[PDB]
């Protein structure tokens, strides 16, 4: 982006090819590959699962006494894992950051290359919560990692989700850019022909967002603010922090 604004269009094209060339070469000589051992399981996984496991017995003994409602039991257990799983997440990463800075699987993920934190976790840590047919997530988590054999049932259970996702990708894909269609229908006559139109009736782009937690003025996210102001033309002049 910087190169584009700074040195011009085609020159940037040159740099891209440049990066493209080196990136690739260095890529081949770097010697990066995947091996089942490359997906390293954190020693603490056996810990956090045990810690969470016993913790599950407390929740059980607590209901087998009559303290927690049928529902409370459930919600509390999910919470148990929802956190336990996230715990194991940062753990695997902590292990790579401190011990194997140059892990193939890891390096791939960190670098904009490939892999996603959530996936990395399904290999080294463990993919834990997969929901039932309807939507209500399962009570038991998928204790395994892909590194180790994902069990018979854990697999089956996980199946439900993969299928719902496939169905979703279907009817959503075949929509055939339906919107690209209608959009085009109402904007297919809009074009740019002009001389600085004289009418100065402008739109003021808001820099602050109202309520979500309650009434409290916040600074709209960096992203969104950009979206509304980037490449725009100021209606009227504005002295802000010292610049005109």
């Amino acid at each position: 982006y910087q190169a584009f604004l700074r040195l011009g269009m085609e020159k940037t094209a040159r740099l891209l090819d440049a990066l493209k060339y080196y990136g690739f070469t260095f890529s081949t000589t770097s010697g990066i590959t995947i091996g089942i051992d490359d997906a390293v399981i954190p020693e603490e996984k056996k810990q956090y699962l045990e810690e969470a496991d016993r913790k599950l017995l407390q929740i059980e003994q607590a209901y087998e006494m009559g303290f927690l409602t049928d529902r409370e039991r459930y919600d509390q257990i999910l919470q148990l894992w929802t956190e336990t799983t996230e715990k194991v997440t940062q753990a695997v990463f902590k292990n790579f950051e401190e011990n194997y800075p140059f892990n193939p699987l890891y390096v791939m993920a960190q670098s904009g290359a490939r892999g996603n934190p959530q996936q990395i976790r399904q290999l080294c840590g463990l993919r834990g919560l997969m929901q039932k047919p309807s939507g209500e997530t399962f009570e038991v988590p998928v204790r395994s990692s892909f590194r180790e054999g994902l069990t018979v049932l854990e697999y089956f259970i996980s199946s439900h989700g993969a299928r719902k996702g496939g169905a979703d990708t279907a009817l959503r894909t075949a929509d055939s850019g339906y919107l690209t269609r209608k959009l085009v229908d109402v904007t297919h006559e809009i074009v740019v022909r002009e001389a600085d139109c004289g009418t100065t009736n402008y739109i003021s782009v808001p820099l602050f967002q109202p309520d979500e937690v309650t009434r409290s003025l916040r600074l709209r996210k960096r992203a969104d603010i950009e979206a509304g102001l980037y490449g725009r033309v100021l209606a009227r002049e504005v002295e802000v922090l010292g610049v005109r």
Partner: protein, 266 residues
């Protein structure tokens, strides 16, 4: 730009699979509609006051002398409370809003800004990063038509192009005297209907019904001013946009040798 905006908004639609959203929210938004979970907007701008329980609750915007009664079912979720102010078109219920109502209460400059943002809302939550420019270009066309309440040329039950009226009114007060004000009412037609009833006949002959379109365009000897990609496509002529751009379709190249050579012809 028309295209470019339509495109940038369409591609992303492929990944948008109580309150309801996703593509449907995008279709509901581009199409002026009454969403699933409607939220009663406040038509009057004053302060708020409630009346609790009773098989029905009630939110009341009252001030100077009148209060706009809002019936909030015993199963609604209202977040404005007994006490403070509420501008026209402010969410009195929780959830989605209805454009038409919001247009009446607050006004147009609000509908527009509502649509734009409420649209972005979905793409943002879906990772997509598209410039507001585009949602704007579209939305603008959603209100390029207005109704008539005070006539001068044609009768007051018509729905015609907003700008075509800025021409009538401009020359009715400016060039030719007799200030016959052409009072109009901003109209929020849906994206689809904006298209449906798009001024040029050529274009109509394409989607709706080719019979009706030509029928009417026949009677009033219609002159299709060739501007717009669709209509001009049929002509098989160079599109009014791109290189066809009236701005550059006519450009001449000469060499200092032949230029002084035209002076040699003089």
């Amino acid at each position: 730009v028309g295209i470019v905006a339509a495109q940038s908004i369409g591609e992303p639609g492929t990944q948008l699979t109580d309150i309801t959203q996703g593509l449907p929210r995008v279709i509901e938004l581009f199409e002026a509609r009454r969403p699933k979970a409607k939220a009663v907007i406040s038509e009057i701008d004053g302060v708020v006051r409630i009346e609790e329980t009773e098989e029905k609750l009630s939110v009341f915007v009252e001030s100077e002398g009148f209060s706009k009664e809002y019936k909030l079912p015993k199963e609604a979720r209202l977040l404005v409370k007994d006490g403070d102010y509420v501008e026209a078109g402010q969410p009195l219920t929780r959830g989605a809003i209805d454009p038409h109502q919001l247009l009446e209460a607050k006004g147009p400059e609000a509908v527009e800004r509502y649509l734009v943002e409420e649209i972005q809302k979905v793409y943002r939550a879906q990772g997509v990063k598209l410039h507001d420019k585009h949602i704007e270009i579209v939305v603008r066309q959603m209100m390029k038509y207005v109704e008539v309440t005070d006539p001068g040329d044609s009768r007051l039950l018509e729905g015609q192009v907003l700008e075509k009226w800025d021409v009538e009114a401009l020359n009715e007060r400016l060039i030719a005297e007799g200030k016959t004000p052409v009072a109009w009412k901003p109209l929020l037609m849906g994206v689809t209907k904006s298209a449906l009833s798009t001024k040029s006949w050529l274009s109509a002959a394409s989607f709706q019904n080719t019979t009706h379109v030509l029928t009417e365009a026949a009677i009033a000897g219609k002159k299709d001013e060739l501007i717009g990609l669709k209509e001009n496509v049929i002509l098989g002529r160079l599109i009014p946009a791109g290189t066809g751009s009236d701005f550059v379709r006519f450009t001449q190249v000469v060499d200092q040798k032949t230029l002084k050579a035209i002076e040699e012809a003089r």
